[PDB]
A paper describes a structure:
Specifically, P1-Met269, P1-Val273, P4-Ala271, and P4-Val273 from the C-terminus of the POD core region, form a hydrophobic cap to trap the conserved residue L-Phe394. The PCTD of P4 strides over P1, forming hydrogen bonds among P4-Ser301, L-Arg459, and L-Arg687. Residues from 249 to 299 of P are the major region interacting with L.
P harbors an oligomerization domain (POD) for self-oligomerization, and the oligomeric P attaches to RdRp of L, tethering the polymerase to NC to extract the RNA strand for both replication and transcription. Here, we resolved two L–P complex conformations from the mumps virus (MuV), a typical member of nsNSVs, via cryogenic-electron microscopy.
Residue numbers in the entry:
A (entry chain A): 4 to 151, 158 to 618, 658 to 1228, 1232 to 1299, 1308 to 1330, 1337 to 1433
B (entry chain B): 248 to 286
C (entry chain C): 248 to 304
Write the structure that this text describes.
């Protein structure tokens, strides 16, 4: 079992300084640590601690005696030796010297294997991209136009990835991490022998243990100790450095950044050696200096260089605080840091935001992290009553206006105050909109206005919230159980008290194992006032991983009851009241979110194709808002929300509970410094304690704070008589101040006028935020006339800047998931390469990089095996033949390979049928020369796997090919069944069924064992049936590493299942060996299929042959969709060129036009008019009768009935079967089902953070017209064609290109294409199998609703049906 | 003149109500004593 | 006599306006925990919700 629960491969936990100090003091390891450096650890009686933990001391003493033996000078005390002992942050400029090139062979073999495998596919991949460009444009330089310089192939990419700097360091640290993980696995198993590894390489001695790594370099005479977490950080950071440097070397777009990034790395490494842990302050300052340099080139003189100068001052402060540098030296260092940012395009200055994690993360301490939050909280804060009341009045106005914009335009139940004027009484009586100018005038009556109950909200409205695991704190009585037992044992012994019990319960498991769990009774904890009296309540922080900024270094955890209350309250706010305020533009739909962001950014960009419009953008950081919220400023908003929800007291819980409890930072290796403070309540406001925090916690009650911020923004906009468009998102808010300017004015003067107009609004916003207690400083706010920042992405002059290096810096050699399959890692690499394509990197380079790193990952997994196997025949077969590795890595995932990135994925995010795309890419590789046609014949003639009726319907488009699903998904599913069968909760009483798999198989047979098989329809109907709703609710489980470990513990796997989960990788490789080794003997009719056959025909044949055992030759319909690249035969028209498809017969095309004279980052008047480009079209019902407030079960039943009638027929028996299947989820009679069901015509069959699909640089100027095209598969096909054309236009002018001296035209002819096909469906196919006995959770409200229609609703639907029957 | 005093006492009513609501908000703003919205 | 209350009530109206002015410009201050006294000691506050009506109701 320990061979599944392997130690982490990447960093996922904070680095703790005192853990390293504990491990180096336990073994008496040599060190130059001052007494204060150790903190509380210096007062420990290490003798007793050494006496216990005998094995740990044995290993550490072994490492110490080896260090003393190899380096005799380590005995030299009082630092009379020349050897220097350096903690992590100070070994940055020496990491290149720690190289174990000799006495290390696995990285060498890995590099040679990757090189030899890449060398066999480079020329084929070049031919592949050449053919893609020739098809999509008609010219062979689609991908090389911007760079033609040097065009790096896959061989060049591999050569510069392996021969770069940091390559030797990344091989050395990969070996170190591999050996450390092996030793950790051995120690956990219990070998207790040979757990110390010595490499003793010349000039670099390294000793590896399961707990520490002792690294010594003879060149610098420096010795360092690294814990396992620090080893993972160093190897992640070095991999990121390698990736960033190699991408800068490869891409002509990022080529200017290579030298600047190298000098930045060198300078900050020496700065790290000089200062220590404070260099991350300099790194976080550079994070904002990127934006400061970005705003250094705006037209407005009064805003140019303000942020630049202020950040330079703050960096000088950070460099001179400790007097490490004098003023002259600090100024010189600042100049050196800044000179790497100047004379760069705006895109590159934003892609220098990759360096943030290139220097690792600071060593964290509980006291230092607690000091920051103890000062933001527990601090006196003066607030303005009037400012609070004005923003409360605007809050009421926005709530009323939103409730009017919904609910048929009527005011909420409201009670006017005695001070309300006649005008307010008439506006309430007439139910008219509250204009914001009116609110700003009468703010003393718009406020003091009690909105009564508006929502019938219930805590159990959403079940997904209860099924997500959140960290829960221990009961207050035992709060010291977080700390390591060794450190607290003696201080508890001296107090004559029992040792505190360790706490390991999880919120999810605790909720699952409750016999009596009622969400109403859960909320009664807060509503009744019991939370303010619970002596068990305890909240604590804990160190946050992968953070370098002082703020946000902790996250809080509460008790089970108060976490449940918090999630219930957040769900209540996010579902009913949060919906009512849309003054901001953030929505859950990402597509319309980025459309709104582009529209907001393009306010002031108007061309010449009176008065005009101008925009000045303001960006504010709200990170410290959570600590600065106070009850006295939120109580009125909380009270009105409580009134609207009917709860007497729910939402003002965070501050009230926090002021009465002492918080602390819970780190196992950071016990309290004073050993006499054994109780949390009596603790003082120092060390790791935060006594009576008056503020709130990050994330907790964020909806209320966001709503207050929106109200304040609207109040400030109204006070200044300025139009704005806020986009508040909790961390970063963006405000686009809008003003009217003369059209004839100069661009610089237009922006000056816009800034002058925005000055008053900014002053009002600052005053309002200070009034509600949030002091706005220079760091937080960023005023710019060109760009704003949203979700860590900058919107610069109608574009989203690339920041591709940040994405490439997190492209590592393994996924953090538990199964650790090759498929999961290759899929992760493919996803990151997709991000690279979307962020401006050459699409040709991205394709080559995807292939190269898939090969690299497979070779690494082959030569660095996670688990030892008795038989190495498969691994030797793959290792000794790199051609097999290349064939497997180039094979698409859907066919059993590891190539998870398709050729069409370079342009289209929405792929439709992935099997058709996979077949198209196989054809491309075959015709280029990468693969062979006999590989395709082997795949077609492959013997069908082990598939059931449930597998064809659970995930359509998939083949009956074994091992297609990773072991990670198997572990997630095992954890969800193990938690579901353990559940005893009143909710989920009937969700679990022992024969659920059999019932789902019978239902899938019912839907599929018909005359024609329609996997889309079966998938939809299953997902909207009772069995499918139970599957969905079981899939609501988190499936987290801790949850998976718990499932494996309480429900152990069988021996065969254990072995198959352990050796899934070897079994998968052995399974592929039957297809990627030699030409097998196949049936003869497969000779008809050629590389020239359309991918849709091959997909039809392949799905017919793959599921042959299941379907017995019957066809599969409704699945196939033409591949985007192969469907279109494009043509780019340049100057005197004439389209060759238009000139020869074909006349169907999607016309694209890019005007001439475009100059990005130049005067908007000169370039053609801008517009929001085509970014996609989501779902957009015309039912017989519209039902309002329909339950989820009712909607699911209507969906099921509509899909059933559309697909299988409209006879009376086809209606009876649909009625029964709906009756598995509702209680309607047959007549009202028929009446309420939406139209069974053209069913879409649609079935189920901020990542823009492109930079939208040149796509905002593109004209599109499908006037020469027919136009719901066709709609999706044409949307794909338009997206492909836009991406083609964008890659024609890559980010290096910023101009358009000529006007280009793209035709993209989809006609005369084999792939487009006619559509015939909706025939009558009756069920060849009787309806299965479907068990139904009748009592469960989340699955079945006994009363889905009211009496009035039933009367109305009956009247509608009768009127239609009589009226005709 | 009685109509004048009635019209002015209307303003007295509204300003007194404003003062009352403002003082109620202040009293309910003390974190020391948790408050509950009626119904 | 009714003429006498007419002028005196006008004096009242103005003060009520004035008090409102100052009340509208008051400052809501949060003491915070600057002293850093153990919560045990700082716990001098109601543990019970009180359903008092603010403004309308
Ligand atoms: Zn054409
Ligand atoms: Zn085709």
């Amino acid at each position: 079992l320990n061979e599944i629960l392997l130690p982490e491969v990447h960093l996922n936990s904070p680095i703790v300084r005192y853990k390293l100090f504990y491990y180096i003091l336990h073994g008496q390891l040599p060190n130059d640590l001052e007494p204060d450096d150790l903190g509380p650890l210096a007062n420990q009686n290490w003798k007793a601690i050494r006496a216990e933990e005998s094995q740990v001391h044995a290993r550490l003493k072994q490492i110490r005696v080896e260090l003393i033996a190899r380096i005799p000078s380590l005995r030299w005390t009082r630092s009379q030796r020349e050897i220097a002992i350096l903690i992590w942050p100070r070994i940055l400029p020496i990491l290149q010297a720690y190289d174990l090139r000799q006495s290390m062979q696995l990285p060498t073999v890995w590099e040679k294997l990757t090189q030899s495998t890449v060398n066999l596919i480079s020329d084929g991949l070049e031919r592949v991209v050449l053919h893609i460009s020739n098809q999509l444009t008609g010219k062979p330089n689609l991908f090389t136009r911007s760079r033609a310089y040097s065009i790096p192939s896959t061989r060049e990419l591999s050569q510069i990835w392996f021969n770069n700097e940091w390559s030797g360091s990344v091989k050395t640290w990969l070996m170190i991490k591999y050996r450390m993980r092996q030793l950790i696995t051995n120690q956990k198993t219990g070998e207790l022998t040979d757990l110390v590894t010595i490499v003793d390489t010349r000039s670099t001695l390294c000793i590896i243990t399961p707990e520490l790594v002792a690294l010594y370099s003879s060149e610098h005479k420096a010795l360092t100790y690294l814990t396992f977490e620090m080893v993972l950080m160093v190897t992640d950071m070095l991999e990121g450095r390698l990736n960033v440097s190699s991408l800068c070397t490869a891409s002509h777009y990022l080529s200017p950044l290579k030298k600047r990034i190298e000098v930045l790395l060198t300078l900050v490494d020496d700065l790290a050696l000089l200062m220590g842990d404070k260099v991350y302050g300099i790194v976080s300052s550079l994070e904002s200096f990127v934006y400061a340099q970005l705003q250094y080139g705006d037209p407005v003189i009064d805003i140019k260089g303000t942020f630049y100068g202020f950040i330079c001052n703050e960096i000088l402060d950070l460099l001179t605080e400790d007097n490490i540098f004098t003023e002259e030296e600090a100024n010189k260092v600042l100049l050196d840091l800044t000179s790497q940012f100047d004379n760069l395009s705006p895109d590159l200055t934003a892609e220098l935001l990759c360096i943030m994690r290139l220097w690792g993360h600071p060593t964290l301490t509980a006291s230092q992290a607690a000091s920051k939050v103890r000062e933001s909280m527990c601090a006196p804060k003066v607030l303005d009553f009037q400012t609070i009341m004005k923003t409360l009045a605007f809050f009421h106005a926005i709530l009323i206006n939103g409730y009017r914009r919904s609910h048929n335009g009527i005011w909420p139940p409201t009670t006017l105050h005695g001070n309300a004027p006649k005008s307010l009484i008439e506006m309430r009586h007439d139910n008219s909109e509250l204009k914001y100018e009116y609110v700003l005038k009468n703010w003393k009556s718009i406020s003091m206005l009690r909105i009564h109950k508006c929502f019938d909200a219930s805590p159990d409205e959403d079940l997904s919230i209860f099924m997500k695991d959140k960290a829960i704190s221990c009961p207050r009585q035992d709060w010291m159980g977080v700390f390591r037992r060794s450190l607290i044992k003696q201080r508890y012994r001296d107090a004559n008290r029992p040792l505190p019990q360790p706490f390991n319960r999880r919120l999810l498991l605790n909720f699952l194992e409750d016999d009596r769990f009622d969400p109403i009774k859960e909320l009664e904890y807060v509503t009744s006032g019991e939370y303010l009296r619970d002596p068990e309540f305890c909240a604590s922080y804990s160190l946050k991983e992968k953070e370098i900024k002082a703020t946000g270094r902790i996250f809080a955890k509460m008790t089970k009851r108060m976490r449940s209350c918090q999630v219930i309250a957040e769900s209540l706010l996010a579902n009913h009241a949060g919906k009512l305020m849309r003054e901001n533009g953030v929505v859950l739909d990402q597509l319309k979110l980025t459309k709104s962001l582009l529209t907001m950014n393009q306010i002031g960009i108007i061309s010449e194709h009176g008065f005009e419009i101008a925009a000045c953008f303001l960006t504010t950081d709200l990170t410290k808002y959570c600590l600065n919220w106070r009850y006295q400023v939120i109580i009125p908003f909380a009270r009105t929300l409580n009134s609207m929800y009917g709860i007497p007291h729910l939402f003002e819980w965070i501050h009230l509970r926090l002021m009465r409890s002492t918080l602390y930072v819970g780190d196992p290796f950071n016990p309290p410094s004073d050993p006499t403070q054994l109780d949390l309540d009596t603790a003082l406001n120092d060390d790791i304690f935060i006594v009576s925090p008056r503020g709130g916690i990050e994330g907790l009650c964020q909806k209320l704070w966001t709503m207050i911020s929106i109200s304040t923004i609207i109040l400030s906009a109204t006070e200044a008589n300025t139009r704005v468009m806020s986009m508040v998102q909790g961390d970063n808010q963006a405000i686009a101040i809008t003003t009217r300017v003369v059209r004839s004015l100069s661009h610089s003067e237009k922006k000056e006028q816009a800034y002058k107009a925005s000055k008053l609004f900014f002053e009002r916003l600052r005053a309002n935020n200070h009034g509600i207690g949030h002091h706005l400083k220079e760091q937080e706010t960023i005023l710019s006339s060109d760009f704003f920042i949203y979700s860590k992405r900058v919107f610069y002059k109608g574009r989203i800047l690339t920041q591709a290096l940040k994405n490439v810096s997190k492209m590592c050699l393994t996924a953090d998931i538990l199964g650790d399959c090759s498929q999961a890692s290759c899929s992760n690499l493919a996803t990151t390469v997709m991000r690279l394509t979307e962020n401006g990197v050459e699409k040709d380079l991205c394709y080559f990089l995807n292939a190269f790193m898939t090969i690299r990952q497979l070779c690494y997994d082959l030569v660095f095996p996670q688990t030892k196997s008795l038989s190495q025949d498969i691994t030797n077969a793959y290792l000794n033949h790199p051609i097999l590795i290349s064939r497997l890595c180039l094979l698409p995932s859907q066919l059993g390979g590891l190539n998870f990135l398709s050729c069409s994925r370079l342009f289209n995010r929405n792929i439709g049928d992935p099997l058709v795309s996979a077949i198209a890419d196989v054809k491309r590789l075959i015709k280029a020369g990468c693969l062979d046609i006999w590989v395709l014949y082997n795949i077609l003639g492959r013997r069908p796997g082990k598939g059931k009726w449930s597998t064809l319907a659970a995930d359509p488009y998939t083949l009956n090919i074994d091992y297609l699903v990773p072991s990670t998904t198997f572990l997630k599913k095992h954890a969800q069944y193990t938690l579901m069968e353990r559940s005893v909760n009143p909710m989920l009483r009937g969700v679990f069924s022992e024969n659920a798999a059999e019932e789902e198989e019978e239902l899938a047979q019912y839907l599929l064992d018909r005359e024609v098989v329609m996997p889309r329809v079966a998938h939809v109907i299953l997902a909207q049936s009772s069995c499918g709703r139970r599957k969905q609710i079981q899939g609501y489980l988190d499936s987290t590493r801790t949850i998976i470990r718990y499932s494996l513990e309480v429900r152990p796997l069988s021996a065969k299942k254990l072995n198959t989960v352990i050796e899934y990788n070897l079994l998968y490789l052995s399974y592929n060996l039957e297809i990627i080794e030699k030409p097998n003997i196949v049936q003869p009719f497969l000779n008809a299929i050629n590389v020239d056959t359309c991918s849709i025909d091959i997909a039809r044949s392949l799905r017919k042959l793959s599921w042959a055992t299941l379907l017995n030759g019957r066809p599969i319909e409704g699945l196939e969709t033409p591949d985007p690249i192969e469907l279109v035969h494009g043509c780019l028209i340049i100057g005197s060129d004439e389209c060759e498809h238009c000139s020869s017969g074909d006349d169907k095309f999607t016309w694209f036009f890019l005007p001439k004279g475009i100059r990005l980052d130049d005067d908007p008047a000169s370039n053609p008019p801008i517009r929001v480009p085509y970014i996609g079209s989501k779902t957009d019902v015309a039912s017989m009768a519209y039902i309002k407030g329909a339950s989820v079960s009712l909607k699911s039943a209507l969906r099921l009935a509509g899909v059933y009638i559309w697909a299988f027929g409209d006879t009376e028996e086809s209606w009876q079967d649909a009625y029964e299947l709906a009756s598995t989820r509702v209680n309607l009679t047959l007549e009202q089902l028929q009446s309420l069901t939406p139209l069974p015509t053209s069913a879409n069959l649609v079935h189920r953070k901020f990542t823009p699909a492109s930079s939208y640089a040149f796509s905002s100027f593109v004209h599109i017209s499908n006037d020469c095209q027919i136009l719901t598969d066709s709609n999706l096909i044409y949307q794909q064609v338009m997206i492909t054309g836009l991406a083609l236009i964008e890659t024609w002018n890559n980010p290096p290109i910023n101009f358009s001296v000529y006007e280009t035209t793209l035709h993209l002819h989809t006609g005369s294409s084999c792939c487009i096909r006619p559509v015939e469906s909706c025939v009558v196919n009756p069920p060849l199998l009787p309806v299965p006995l479907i068990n139904v959770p009748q009592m469960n409200k989340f699955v079945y609703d006994p009363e889905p229609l009211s009496l009035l609703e039933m009367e109305k639907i009956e009247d509608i049906a009768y009127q239609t029957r009589i009226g005709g | 003149m009685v109509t004048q005093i009635k019209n002015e006492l209307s303003t007295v009513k509204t300003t007194l109500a404003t003062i009352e609501g403002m003082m109620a908000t202040v009293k309910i703003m003390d974190p020391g004593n948790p408050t509950g919205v009626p119904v």
